[PDB]
Amino acid sequence: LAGLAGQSRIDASLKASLLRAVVERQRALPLVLADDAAIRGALLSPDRPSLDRINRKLEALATSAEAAVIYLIDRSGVAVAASNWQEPTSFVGNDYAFRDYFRLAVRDGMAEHFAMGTVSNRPGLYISRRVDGPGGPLGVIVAKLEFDGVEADWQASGKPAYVTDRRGIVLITSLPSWRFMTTKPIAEDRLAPIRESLQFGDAPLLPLPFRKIEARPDGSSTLDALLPGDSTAAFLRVETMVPSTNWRLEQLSPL
Amino acid sequence: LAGLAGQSRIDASLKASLLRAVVERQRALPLVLADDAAIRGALLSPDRPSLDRINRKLEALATSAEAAVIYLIDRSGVAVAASNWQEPTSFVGNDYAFRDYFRLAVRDGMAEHFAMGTVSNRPGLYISRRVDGPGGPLGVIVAKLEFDGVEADWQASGKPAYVTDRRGIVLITSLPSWRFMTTKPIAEDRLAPIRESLQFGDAPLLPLPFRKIEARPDGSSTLDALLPGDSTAAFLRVETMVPSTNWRLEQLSPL
């Protein structure tokens, strides 16, 4: 068992590292596109030829980065150009002012917020960066980062895992029906903030269904957990911070 | 004598996506600076105000992307701007007119060249791309990525791993011992150009210190390794291609 806590911990730490790496690959996009002269170019003078170029510029990057979408928003919250410009789900002509990833980036310069997609209903990290001219803001570049990939790996690791934020909400998980569950408690009067924050409303916000929790001296714990399709089993849980985020990552190893 | 042959098989998969994410965060920056009217404009019409604008631009990117150095090289080999401009080790003014990353950039549009820093002595992947003007080539924009962080996550797995290119040279490795060793035999004649191309020339280019061997099915084999830390254990050996590269990752695992 203590010989299982050892191996669990390195798995954990490694999954957390692959996650770190994956978040940072995506952060490089808005980072480099905030300063990009053709972006700036387009916002200063948004003519059709110009915005078609950026449409294609971004189409290619969503595909080389592996963003679900990269898109560029007007001074006033309108998406003017978008990786998905040729698809019937083209964000172009959409209103993002009531964003959080929008208004926060407008206010602070950059933002990162895990939210459900208006039309999609698919979770992910909106990574955004304000675009500037000399002497004033011009708009916002957003790239949105989905975790189906790392969630798929873990699911094949044989040690399930989910990730919670500071508030305690599972954002990323290898078992989808644990998404938006809680790990703390949480406090009644911060619930709609949150539902709103998440762009969901009716998220569960109930505790993970872990039963029979036993804390261990070395900091592990055991619990019982009914995984889907399975009869109930006992697990070793270990935990680790995900570097350069404010997330904890939590892992189960079958006993 | 059962098959943790299924385990090393995925820890390796994990190691190799860790590596693709890390490389990929760096490929995005030359991919977009190469085309930037400011980067072009600087090269096409350089003046001090311009060139420091870039210097600053490159420090901010490099600092954010965790790139060891990003820098901009003249049509004629001279670095005109660099992320380390303010540092005493600034690449600004250096002649690189005959570095593989430079010349291959120019001919091919783009290059990924693994070498040892001239003055620094640290290994890294130099990622470069031609800047094109209305003229023809104007310069090259280069980003250098080092692999200490990922070699450290690999070392902590307790499954040493390393990555060979097409010439079977070990470029990246979780033991240092072991850099610039070899999976292939490498014929007499080839040592000096290969050394030149590693920019190191002192590279042992000896075959890896562990034989054993046999086959199979798969592409597997048994193995017995030097290293330190425990005399000389026995190890199984998995092999897997690192996606979006020509690198092969190999990994050994204790008995």
Curated annotation (Swiss-Prot), chains A, B:
Which regions of this chain are Periplasmic-facing, per the record's topological domains?
A: 1-255
User: What processing steps or modifications follow its translation?
Assistant: Autophosphorylated.
Q: Where does this polypeptide localize?
A: Cell inner membrane
**Residue stretches in coiled coil:** none
Question: Per its UniProt entry, which superkingdom is the organism in?
Answer: Bacteria
The protein's role, per its UniProt record: Member of the two-component regulatory system DctB/DctD involved in the transport of C4-dicarboxylates. DctB functions as a membrane-associated protein kinase that phosphorylates DctD in response to environmental signals.
Q: What is this protein called?
A: C4-dicarboxylate transport sensor protein DctB
Q: Which residues of the full protein are shown?
A: 54 to 308 of 621
